[PDB]
Amino acid sequence: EVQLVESGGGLVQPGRSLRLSCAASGFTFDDYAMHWVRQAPGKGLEWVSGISWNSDSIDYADSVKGRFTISRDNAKNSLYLQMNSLRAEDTALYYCAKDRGYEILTPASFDYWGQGTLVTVSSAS
Amino acid sequence: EVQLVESGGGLVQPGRSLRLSCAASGFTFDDYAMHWVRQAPGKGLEWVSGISWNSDSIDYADSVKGRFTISRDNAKNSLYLQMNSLRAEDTALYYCAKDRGYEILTPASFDYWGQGTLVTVSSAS
Amino acid sequence: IVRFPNITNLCPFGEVFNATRFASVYAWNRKRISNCVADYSVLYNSASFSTFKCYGVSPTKLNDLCFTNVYADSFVIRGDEVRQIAPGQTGKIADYNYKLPDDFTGCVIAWNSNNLDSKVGGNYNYLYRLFRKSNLKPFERDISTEIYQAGSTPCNGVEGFNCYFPLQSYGFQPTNGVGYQPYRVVVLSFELLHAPATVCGPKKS
Amino acid sequence: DIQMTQSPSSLSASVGDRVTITCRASQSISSYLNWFQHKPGKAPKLLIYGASSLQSGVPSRFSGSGSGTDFTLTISSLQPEDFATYYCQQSYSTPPYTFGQGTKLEIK
């Protein structure tokens, strides 16, 4: 019954930046970890990033290190993902998963998800 | 020309703690990473621990994870190491190495070493 | 035929057990459970607990025995080191971390927790005390972190030879063996004393 | 490193059959695998955490098994709302949370 709604998607030119947000209201947010999972337009799922219950331990996917900065706001029950220096291979679909535990790199997997938000990187109208 | 000397080598019983300290004189101790290397009596070299220029990043070997505690004191220009819950396989020879860089896990290797101090764990004279 | 009032105000065992953050063994937290109906059947019928040992009272005779106070202590310790949580036992935990009285009456709960308390790099939020001047009395805690005077040279608050740090942290990691994986532990204590009885088992009608 | 594979890609069955899908890993992961049900129109959902532990609230028709390197998910009844793409994920190695490729399941 937990809710995870995302926004900030759309179309941007290559090399520009855009931000994402994901609001959670169906559970206690101050003591769970969260991730971001990317789904390619025609390929399988792929992990992107993750944050701890408090912003102490943060890990990134190998292909997105040095470009993406994930943040978190415990007061407003929301987390964000700042995307920077986008290229042509990041036109995929982005989810907002929830970790079962309280750390980032644990055997515990993603428990609850949310509907994806569509982003596009190309030069068009 | 730099000198790396340590102490604390002796005989202790299994399950008893023992603390080692290494004195560095010939260089600038404030901005070099430092490591510990173990020489088994009948085997080759082996890495034990490592600390950064300042104590933010600390790493341990897998076989000594949750048993040892490496420290650092830039004020007196010397480092320490704590051995806890010893078993019979820690009867080896320990060296006090110096890293070229300032981080713990970098491609830069160990440039200057020091003479080792032998430790044994048993119940005898 | 028997007709008893409605079942209401159940004890919050769920939040004590199904929690996310457990304190270290040297700084275990104690919670007083009282004034509620305590159904211990939901604890026993669960298959999640690997270790369920009860001292002084059969587990299925708890749903009829009415005590006055129930204390819950939660902490995380190693795998092959949970055997020390028992009356009249010896070891580092019993000596310096958590001492149980010889005539203890209660139950001890323990289940594996490698799925939450193990970080691939190393979880260092959990520490266990190594030294103290004397053995812990039954049911007390030590929080001070003074330098342990191993020898006779006064430490004077400065770490040195024979001046060790008493707290050491577990290097929990998924690669560890079964004997080195974390094990969540919950200890329930039951008291009888000169006061009105509050906690009871459910009375079916 | 580690590698994750999916032996079947497309399967066909009916409402009254049983389906088994196997997931294979490059190295031992010690019973740390997860299976996800991804409907094409909504958010994907987790079915099995751990090797053979079934999550709360999902039907008992899905049954998982296997340990070490080779794993398998089994479905018993095949209700006609069980069309989706299923992925297997490992959470034990240094490359974090590696997903296998898709496994399309259609009924005919």
Added chain:
Amino acid sequence: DIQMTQSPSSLSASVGDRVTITCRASQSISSYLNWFQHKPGKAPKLLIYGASSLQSGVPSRFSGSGSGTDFTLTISSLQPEDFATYYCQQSYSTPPYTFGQGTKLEIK
């Protein structure tokens, strides 16, 4: 995981000979190798850091080469005071600073 191996085990030569020691890695490390001269009675030293970069303060008799998965070290003359045990380590893979097994060398 990475496994580090040392192909030869023992050698014997003369004052003016030329010998080769080779160190093989399980996986590609991209020329991140380090050679150490372990004198039996005192502290070990470093000869070559990086692929074949000669450390300042040692005679130019030693010279290494190789990148990728195979490396080689050669001693130009092998003067009688250079007998020792030599080690190769990698500093690129996840298991940090894995040393190879020794190579005892005798001059006669």
